[PDB]
Amino acid sequence: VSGAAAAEAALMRALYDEHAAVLWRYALRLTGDAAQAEDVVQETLLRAWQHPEVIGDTARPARAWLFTVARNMIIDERRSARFRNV
Amino acid sequence: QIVERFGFSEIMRSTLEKDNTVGTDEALLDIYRKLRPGEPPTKESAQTL
DNA sequence: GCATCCGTGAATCGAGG
DNA sequence: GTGTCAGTAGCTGTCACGGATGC
RNA sequence: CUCGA
Known part of the structure; x- marks a missing residue:
């Protein structure tokens, strides 16, 4: 039913x-x-x-996964695209 | 005890009276949500910082 | 109906690093 | 592809003034 | 930044 398509949001928020x-x-x-x-x-x-395979196991630290995702993206920005212009 | 220390001044009595929330675990969270807004307020997470 | 708080403004030219 | 705590620096050492902003 | 009338 529709309650599930709403449950997606209520799970993210x-x-x-x-x-x-x-x-x-x-x-x-x-x-x-x-x-x-x-x-x-x-x-x-x-x-x-x-990637819902991470939040589904509610009992596990999700924040800990998030930090690594970010930490990687930042250096991806410190890539060649940054060395020349910044 | 607060009234015990600062009682000689009407201004401090008036502060404790015009106060909004009372309780050791209440004003603690009141500080937490003004210092680091947008985060869930745990009693120990505020007691720590 | 009024105190707070926001936004505005605050000289002219000139030298070198 | 990512997965145990994992959390700014800096800073207020300006002021007069008018009027929209807000209790 | 430091400086001159």
């Missing part, structure tokens, strides 16, 4: 309120730019919604 405002600070310390951090946070959480 429940991890947002507990992990987004904290993940932001991590990418913040690592980039010194709150704007890029704002970008990386949404990128990360979109992937998370795309």
